[model samples]
Target chain A: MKTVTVRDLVVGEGAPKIIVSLMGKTITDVKSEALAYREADFDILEWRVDHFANVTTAESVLEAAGAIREIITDKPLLFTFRSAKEGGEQALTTGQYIDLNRAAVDSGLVDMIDLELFTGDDEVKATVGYAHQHNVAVIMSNHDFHKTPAAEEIVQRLRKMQELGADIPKIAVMPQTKADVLTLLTATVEMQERYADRPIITMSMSKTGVISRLAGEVFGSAATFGAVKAPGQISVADLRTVLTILHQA
Target chain B: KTVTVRDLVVGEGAPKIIVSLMGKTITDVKSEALAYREADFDILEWRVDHFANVTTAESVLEAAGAIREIITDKPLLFTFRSAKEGGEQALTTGQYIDLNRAAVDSGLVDMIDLELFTGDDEVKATVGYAHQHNVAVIMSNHDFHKTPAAEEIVQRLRKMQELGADIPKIAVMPQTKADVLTLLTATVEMQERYADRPIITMSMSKTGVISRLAGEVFGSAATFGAVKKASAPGQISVADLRTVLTILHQA
Candidate 1:
């Protein structure tokens, strides 16, 4: 696997890093939210850029990036703005979405940018290349909100993204049963052990699959998103406890 | 910011719910209207696959023109169900593709539904031609047997997304309790990760009925319901689904 650096945290080819998704409603809210977790300690904080109201404008995104930069000064910060079609707020044009992402990448406030690989070949390449120009790591991604596809297809898609120069090629799918989760995790481990050229962040999501977020590292995923809130999250307290346990084990 | 799909917005921040009416014959019109009226759906999908005699392009266009009289505001989506994906009847894949092209050319429909299996290079190019004339493409796949694991499901959706379909819809059978879990979790993960394109996810079976509303909360772009009789088995009534949506939002 190739190596990449997000700020100072080196990923790929080594142990996976623990990441947290900080969900907030506004820039101020996120800044304040980061303070609580900063003291607790986490390897990376993924700003749920989709949750903020003012992220559509270039100026607002830059402002939000500045505010977040101050709070997560030393820790690696990743930026992501989910679209409604992909399961986010029904707002922002694809152009506007890319602009918001580019602003963060250009601001040097983000260590990595999560760009959906399904955003058409042209759009994906353009966005990832723009990020690369700014020296920001690109995490090419895809989400399956339905069920999983065949194993060969899964390997093919990830390999396609890897060929596109993704520092991390990731996929998140839903697991209907233990077998479902097993298939995804097995793919992740096998891909990493064999064909993966960069860090892979493969995960099975939902309450049942949440364990994969913690256990994925054992299979070769370099990072996972832990929830920050209840009902849908793995809290800071729990993450610290779990990571400590994993390390001790 | 305003690209029109018939009279609807096809741009950013546009409404995600697209209501489609699926009717078997001209006689099914009233039932379809009643279903859409009660459900408050945004688009109506008119399934042209069930019309045995109306195989001609002229007949299908005539039907779409007539259906427009009943549905004035909501966009009309034209789809020909293919046998491979659990549709009503059989048509050559080429014939099905042609039917889709004819629907787009009619200027009566706002979107054309094409099965992903038909989205071969030639079929995809034809779908793209429809887009050139202002019609949206709904590339879909249906599996009535069983739902695959999460990884596979996500990969399938990514394929649809990569293909440049305006909207991608996936329906799979949920034979067991675990199937529903797979569907919902996939919705959530996709909602968080792939937020660029619209996706429709549902489970087809009495056991997986709740997954329709589950899709709404889990990040699905939209859900489908039966108007007259259920289109697919396990379809939830719009009435029940609307109530669930209300309750979930409040909760």
Candidate 2:
């Protein structure tokens, strides 16, 4: 099978890439959201399967993915079903998370699948290898909603994500202080400049850390979030604008 | 309604790509034009403010003719961005009006960009002259510092329409993320509720790039991109701009 580089191009190529999240609770809702998101400006389309009510049902999940495939026929589709541990909307059993990622990797409907880094060492590694067998790239991630970890620890986490095989290593940490935001930025720079062989994504969330969004291109992040007025992210439109500005500079 | 410039149609289908060429000398203008041919953009905007000989009508005309001769296919838009509107050169009201008239008389351009805030009489007369000479006018206004309220943005475009602008254009800077949305909001409202002709809107700088790429979805008829350098703050390369435009066009 041929590998798709998340989308049309490599993640680290030019300006930091833009990814918009799609959330829905029902099949019709998924279709509606997909059709609407089709017009939004972005590089990759991520489906938050955790938002779907019937994620436990195989056909329901497949149908939801297929519906998005039909509407968003061009850009890459990233299947992500995050857990409550990672500040995600829903929760699932450890086995369920592993199986869910496997189902998406084999479905051929998605270009990339996101798996949390600490889902479990054996489980995460097994899924990573399984995803690779199918030529599917994985955006291995970790998220800290409460506080920013030490800069070295954050860098080491990314290094481990790379060690375990991630096309993209992503981490989003909440910033409690203005200085903590720079800690995340520091981790990103350290990981990117030294340990990283591939592209990485990092952001210090909330209004205080908003600079990370615009500085992604400069700080070695290859992608950032948008499509939300979350404390940090702007519309993908605004995010793209700042990313381009930073790249130009 | 679509405005036809040479063979390109503005305000229809996919948003068209416009790349500005800024060259200080006549030689640089021609050089830039020749180099820009590879960009494959739909429109060529010559920012005349960057030109050193704007006070000399013959020199300005000579450079305009050279650009037209070199880039035979794309529509050429003559723009004299005054210093008041973030341009390099400052012009007296009369000097600005005369420079526009000179370009209109030269007939080397398919369209011209006029500022909405220029004197009402000057704008009306210039629009009439450009129309008489078969040159379309893109009446524009810019707030390089911050985006105005959506209502204010729509009103500016509407006023440009009343002033006889063939195409109305507005560019603003976004001090915050919401400010970017404000520009998009004005674009959506203006395109849906008010604009009778093609309108071009951009939130200036990198933060406002969506205003440029989301034109097809939000009702912008044209967007500015760059070849060698961006005349404005937020222009991505034309190739990248075209890629984004194509994705949005299909999506």
Candidate 3:
């Protein structure tokens, strides 16, 4: 397996890295949230740009990213504008999506950028190429809010992301049954054991699948997400506590 | 895959939910047994070591008879978990064997739990006596600190089978998610390859709680639950556990 190094942290090895998101709606809220996470022992901080109110222009996006950079010095920043179809708060045109991510990468403010794999192949490849040129890692992600796909399909999607030159491949799906959760875990293990050569992030969403979040390390997920007050999400502190106990053991 | 203790069958059919009762007095035991029976638990594990009069053979036998009357015809598993394995009492091997023999001879228990780590002679003698009296045996091992490797856990369960246990049970404390996976992996391997009768495996503690709920999926036959207070660490309430198991089984 390959490891992706971001600042002082090394992903794709040992314990699963904890990635907490900044979900504040305003620039001041985002800065305060970034500073609040300064005391947390998380490995990466994600800026959910779709959640920000002042992110209408490339200039405002860079300004917000700059403020977060100043507050969370040296911590790897992951810039994400999750699309509405993939459970994000905003809907962006294909051109707008490409432009926004390109600006974020050009600003040199983010260590990584989250690009949806379902975005047109040409657009995704272009954005990925631009991010790489700017020395920014790419996390090619896919999300299913309704149901988890079959194990074979999940593996195919993640493998496709890797083939497209993504630094990290990720998938998040909502599991309606325990069997669905098991399918996700089985695919994660299968992918990590034989197919994938880099870190992968996979989760079965909602309360029923919370075990996936805590048991990610065992299932071969290299990174996990924790939230502040999001529904169906574990708190950052609680995730840290459980991860600490699991890691120490 | 089902192991029948009287009419109750535990294994590949319907998952059996066992509730542990640890009341100190005969009256307390009777009331708790009635409550657990009302809650629809399939098996009752009577933790005799927790009884205040466990030192006396007569008190222990009388308490068993009383509990038997309260939970008439419901399968009762008599267990005197030793302090060495996270129990309340410490007994010499002789005392342990004698106590188990008395419980079996009293003709009140459907099954008896004998610790595999106890002396081999005592284990064989106790198991032999229980079988002669038509009582099933569950050879158990408990690790309160850390979960062993998958191979070690599989070896322990196989050893219990070799000792003539009707059901082989193992419980270990898991320090990591990998430890829980190891435990479940061993359980699946044992159930598929080595086990003739039903087997029980648990990864203990809150971190290992998922195993208790998902054990059946990994080939474990039964799980320990609580009516009021848990007999072991990380036990869930019988009602809540039943709901989760029902969902998983139906799903």
Off by over 4 Å in 2: A1-249
Error of 1 at B211 (Å): 1.6
Off by over 4 Å in 3: A229-232, B1-99, B104-111, B114-251
Clashing pairs in 2: A241-B206, A241-B207, A242-B206, A242-B207
Give the TM-score comparing model 3 with the true structure, all chains together: 0.61
Q: Write the per-residue lDDT of candidate 1 for residues A86-157, one digit (tens) a residue.
A: 677657777877877878888888898888877667777888889989898888888886677666677788
Best by DockQ: 3
Write one digit per residue (lDDT tens) for candidate 1, span B1-251. Answer: 22456666543331234444555666665456654654565677877777654577776776787788766888888877777888778887677777877777788888888777775795568767887888888778888889988667776776777776787778888765556657766766665667466677777766565556444345565666654466777655555445444433332
Tens digits of per-residue lDDT for model 2 on A165-202? 88888999998865576578778867866788888899
lDDT of 2 at B229: 83
Ranking by lDDT: 2, 3, 1
Q: Which lDDT values do the candidates have, in the order given?
A: 0.69, 0.84, 0.83
